[PDB]
Design a protein around this ligand. Structure first.
Ligand SMILES: O=P(O)(O)OC[C@H]1O[C@](O)(COP(=O)(O)O)[C@@H](O)[C@@H]1O
Ligand SMILES: O=P(O)(O)OC[C@H]1O[C@](O)(COP(=O)(O)O)[C@@H](O)[C@@H]1O
Ligand SMILES: O=P(O)(O)OC[C@H]1O[C@](O)(COP(=O)(O)O)[C@@H](O)[C@@H]1O
Ligand SMILES: O=P(O)(O)OC[C@H]1O[C@](O)(COP(=O)(O)O)[C@@H](O)[C@@H]1O
Lengths: 418, 419, 414, 414
């Protein structure tokens, strides 16, 4: 019966067309949902109590929209998110600051600059930078974040024709991308936006950088408890296109059904994830990926190949900054990527990456370093057992380094859960 | 090379850089918002008739915007109400040549005594197509062909898949049906809403394999009922329906009762046109090949060679002589980039082929030529003349011409240069 | 049916799996399609020997002008023509020049004049290093020799490196493994063979594999295991023609050598993995607005769809037949021509079976076309290509004269 | 770098395009990986001569029990072992049974097999295997002291070809014995049997030998024919782990040159392997595996390709972890470190495995024992030309001593 679930008949098909023909509404998803949910905070979702239900429903990243609301307002939003998250101390939740932006203007307004200072002063994990048209706009955001905000991920919002055309140069200096379809479908003809979305997600997947699909994904749930047929389609297709993250704006910020909307995005994403045709996707991401002399990159593809060969339940990776986890996620394993880290910020930021489940390790270093490695891996296993990822008799891939400190992942081991 | 013959923009347009990519992923990465779609929109648009779309004046606007099939929803309105809808559709058509098919969508359980009277009414008024509600098995469609009776033998039956049993018994339904509607409205109530995309993609895929029309239906541009522009999810839905493989896309309340029926039709046409250029034919044609069975049907054999020929030379169009439409369906199933211009003497076949993606019907109304061979060539020039006027063909284009040797015997392909 | 000519292996989904399904019990049924070139010499000169060799499968007779006087080769030519006329299989006559032993020697020029005056069909030009070597040959053949196919022999390092400019201006290529394996290290020749055949297939231009294919049969009645391997693999690499030199020119078993090449080729041809090969030749091939090329691929696609027995093509110069052959149909290409020279030259193209039509033009052209197609069918029946009920593709044109092929028709045999 | 070892052809998108990119100026860099089996006889029995042959690349000495007394073969064994010791160069020793034979499992074969155990042969080539029980008769003959001897079944007739799958199931490997096969079945069908059996062995991960007349003419000539070099190259391209010499080394006048010629051809052909297709096709068809050694191997091989790893260093006791690497045909050399002298000789049956006998008392700490073998691996590879400083290598080891290979590490050579 294992082979009846999570669309494995379809995953085994020999062509894409045959894989489509074998999709089965009776094949239940079993894997953990892997596409992260970004929920925009507003009057419908500011309260600590609302945020707790949203966390339980699946929210992974809380978006602050600085197009509206004072610093004081956003400061309250941030504190309420942190209090909701800590009420479960457990789900790390990242905090993303989405800039007001231009409204050939400069890459940053005076308002933008003050807003990014605020976000650094408040430890935001992510910036969604508006109206990025060229790499210098990204550099401008980086500089305004200044020295204390070097670890903040910059996700460039592509919102107009120029940003689409200069995409390669924007992507190169950015940590990731948002397909900002709201403004995009005003700035270019609305019937073209799906080409820009598909193009940008394809290119981000190739580059191993996170990509966010945003705006009106479940629009009618602002007023209705259930979405339209086009809205469920759009969520599922964003996941099939390759998006790491899917986003809610008014559905959570102001609508009448914020929690049901998060839950609806979770339910669709899980079905869509199981329908991904990994056989074609992994092979193309291989052929099109370049040779690397980087041991983390080399170890990562070896581990994903290995995971596919034994239907591994998970890949446990010890990571300090999230990078080794990102390099696993870029090959889209079906196996869950369980990222054990000591860094609370990296546990939050890896939610930018499809299929990465962070575990914040809070135990004091062991004297023998190799003993500390194994204790974190064990932490990894036990948490996976108790959270549903792992059963005794499962096979996991463990991915670790030869010495302490970031940059030295280079070891892959195959392990049975007992 | 071909740049001289066809132009220097030609290969910039139509997403052709993405089309010659070696992998699906590289194809996605090469999609280009500045590659204008030159080809004629090929996915048919079904528009549900209601208060917003009953004016003869309105219907003519809708035809111009791209409506190809008028849907009559027998869930509401008397026989007299629907007779009038049929009447106004036919007058808009003749008061202009673009055939519009007329489809009767049964009430079903809300085959009832009511449905039988509705189907008899449909034959009486010469409907081209029945959308049969809640087909759960093959016998359900036999009940429908029986109701249509002897006078209704040429009516196409498109089975609406609306619940779990329909999805589960899909293969036996498709065997006995002319086509399928993925009826997402009720399906999304009868099964969990988050599974409908699985049922949609499976059904469009299997219909594509079987060479039968498939319609994607319901809430595609819903917000346009009250808004002049659609949501980002709605445009996405239309585009992916076309990329999924759908022959037809549908509007319900958007045309039946909304305030922007004409703008909705126009928006589907614009999305469908972009999406069709973005189809990765290299993979699709190859998978349709490897899966489809060997065939000793000469018309089937000619069509695949004709489509292959069309791709080798960037044929502007495949002109096919068809009596029932079948030869044009068998071209359509290989999804040429070239328009399939189908010349037929059968006004009904001409209306019904709108169910098949990429078929542009041309009704020919001249008495046969004394010499048949002369009758063929005359219809073919009619195809070419109509094609030139409508912007399909220019002098110097290449076309593929598909005819027969005897007067269901299509079995000749000819490569022809437009004078 | 499906336990013959490796069809189980043909259906396989990958090359690995096609190989695993090759079956020594699956008998070939299609007519042998790779043409056999036999070098004429003391063992093969007599009319009586040439008749046994035609029966055995020789398609092209090679005159090696490294030895023998004009009188000697004139005798070889006349003996081939008498053997051929004794029957019916057209046999081409190919003049293989002496060459440098300076593009063209004075000797080469006299030899080429001789071959033109004697109506030879093909020239194997020795030591071709660059496009100008081919042009020289072409000029030496002069005006009366415009219709003679030039097959450039690649025999050294420069020729391999400059292969693309040689291939562009040549009708075809010979992998002249004899001198090549001396000019470059012997352990590399297989690379130059595979590259050049691959490139000739992509270009749709005939390629010949030559030299030592069955060498030990010069003295022995049976070949070695490496020799059968080499023939089978030349066919699987993509060669249009395979060649015999000493095996037929001077050895003790000329006829058996031809018979052995025939038997191997037939088995190898059935082992061709068309699924992969057609798709790759379709993909790599370039868009074309030439109606003959468009019709040809459409016709080969159609033939694969209905397991067609043959593609009957009407051709004047052979070109429409070459453009079919370049997609390697499993179906036999039956080329109906009035041109005796074209019926001989099409033997350069894998899988083309010429039929010389000698009947008088019908007054109504369209009647002449149908009579030739029918000629094609009846001969196909009598010769074993076609059973009643088979399906054939017929490829013809819209107007008289070459260059106008543009019609394809699907026909059932009755 | 990327101009050598046919790397431009390696990154082609299609097989046909890969053929078109093969390049006679792309020199091989990797170590020759296909093993060379040399039959021992009067031309190749002297210790001096066997030494020259080992330097030329012989990896396996074949004893043909069709000819010569037990004493004759005891001396052949003696001289191979002395040549090996008088230099590290593990040479396997294979006993090829007489089997059902007629000259100008028998009682004789059993005495030969028992003699083989007595003298510690590593491999048996079992003649005329027709079915699975025949292989069981041979492992019975070898008895309890012969349990580690590998049994390579010779397929020599129609019945063995037909029952091949059951033969392969129970055998350690296969020899395509083309000599007798090409008399028992039509000669023109042997290439089909060869290609199938190499394909099925490749799929099964078991070694396959191509044998007989590969360089036959070198018995009397110092240079091979063009069909012979072709046949060696195609056997390597077909997927053979081992290529063999019979009369060319046993009785001919150029044994050393024959070995050298096979080494040179094998090296070129191995670079011309289109790994992208092969690795991909081996993936799809090979089954989901829950064995940690198989999982590590495929992950190690993928890793090796991602970084152009010069070597995969594996610690192995029986050879198995190295065989499971070798079945994916890495371009990187598989350097197999083992304490088992007999494992080290036997792994030569597996393409691309370079054994290293490690001779040191275990270290106090097991983890310390592992890294000393790994370092022994790196130092040998450095000395032998496999590794340079700054290279990347993939290291495969286990978690517990004793079928527990389950770790790969990426390591930069310093
Ligand atoms: O993903 P990153 O940031 O490169 O971290 C990976 C690092 O984590 C580790 O596995 C453990 O390092 P620490 O014990 O110092 O936390 C290192 O061996 C490895 O270099
Ligand atoms: O698509 P269909 O219904 O099979 O039509 C194909 C028929 O059209 C034709 O081209 C023309 O037929 P008619 O002129 O008799 O109407 C026939 O040759 C062919 O049999
Ligand atoms: O292969 P080629 O030399 O172009 O010949 C093809 C020609 O044969 C024909 O079918 C017959 O032409 P003919 O009447 O001159 O014999 C032409 O229609 C066609 O153009
Ligand atoms: O390939 P094999 O025969 O299964 O041996 C691999 C074994 O070698 C090792 O890497 C080394 O351990 P040993 O000390 O027993 O040689 C084991 O951990 C591993 O299980």
């Amino acid at each position: 019966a294992f082979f009846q679930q999570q669309q494995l008949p379809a995953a085994m098909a020999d062509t894409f067309l045959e894989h489509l023909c074998l999709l089965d509404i009776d094949s239940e998803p079993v894997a953990a949902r892997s596409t992260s949910i970004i929920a925009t905070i507003g009057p419908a979702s500011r309260s600590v109590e609302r945020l707790k239900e949203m966390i339980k429903a699946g929210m992974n990243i809380a978006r602050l929209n600085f197009s509206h609301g004072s610093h004081e307002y956003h400061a309250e939003s941030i504190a309420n998110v942190r209090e909701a998250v800590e009420s479960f101390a457990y789900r790390p939740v990242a905090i993303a600051l989405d800039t007001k932006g231009p409204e050939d203007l400069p890459g940053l307004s005076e308002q933008d600059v003050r807003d990014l200072r605020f976000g650094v002063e408040h430890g935001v994990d992510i910036v969604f930078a508006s109206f990025v048209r060229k790499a210098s706009d990204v550099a401008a955001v980086r500089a305004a974040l200044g020295p204390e905000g070097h670890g903040i991920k910059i996700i460039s919002k592509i919102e107009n024709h120029e940003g689409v055309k200069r995409f390669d140069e924007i992507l190169e200096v950015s940590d990731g991308i948002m397909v900002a379809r709201g403004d995009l479908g005003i700035e270019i003809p609305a019937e073209k936006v799906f080409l820009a979305q598909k193009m940008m997600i394809g290119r981000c997947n190739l580059a191993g950088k996170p990509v966010v699909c945003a705006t009106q994904m479940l629009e009618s749930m602002i007023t209705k408890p259930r979405p339209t047929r086009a809205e469920t389609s759009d969520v599922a297709n964003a996941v099939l296109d390759g998006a790491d993250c899917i986003m809610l704006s008014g559905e959570t910020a102001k609508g009448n059904f914020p929690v049901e909307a998060v839950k609806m995005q979770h339910a669709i994403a899980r079905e869509a994830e199981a329908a991904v045709y990994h056989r074609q996707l992994f092979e193309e991401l291989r052929r099109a990926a370049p040779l690397s002399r980087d041991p983390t990159e080399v170890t990562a593809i070896g581990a994903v190949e290995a995971a596919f060969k034994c239907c591994a339940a998970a890949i446990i990776v010890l990571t300090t900054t999230g990078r080794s986890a990102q390099l696993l996620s870029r090959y889209r394993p079906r196996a869950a990527v369980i990222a054990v880290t000591r860094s609370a910020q990296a546990a939050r930021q890896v939610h930018l990456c499809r299929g990465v489940f962070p575990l914040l390790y809070r135990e004091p270093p062991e004297a023998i370093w190799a003993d500390d490695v194994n204790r974190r891996v064990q932490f990894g296993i036990e948490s996976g057992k108790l959270r549903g990822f792992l059963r005794v008799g499962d096979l996991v891939i463990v991915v670790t380094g030869w010495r302490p400190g970031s940059g030295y992942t280079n070891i892959m081991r195959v392990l049975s859960i007992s």
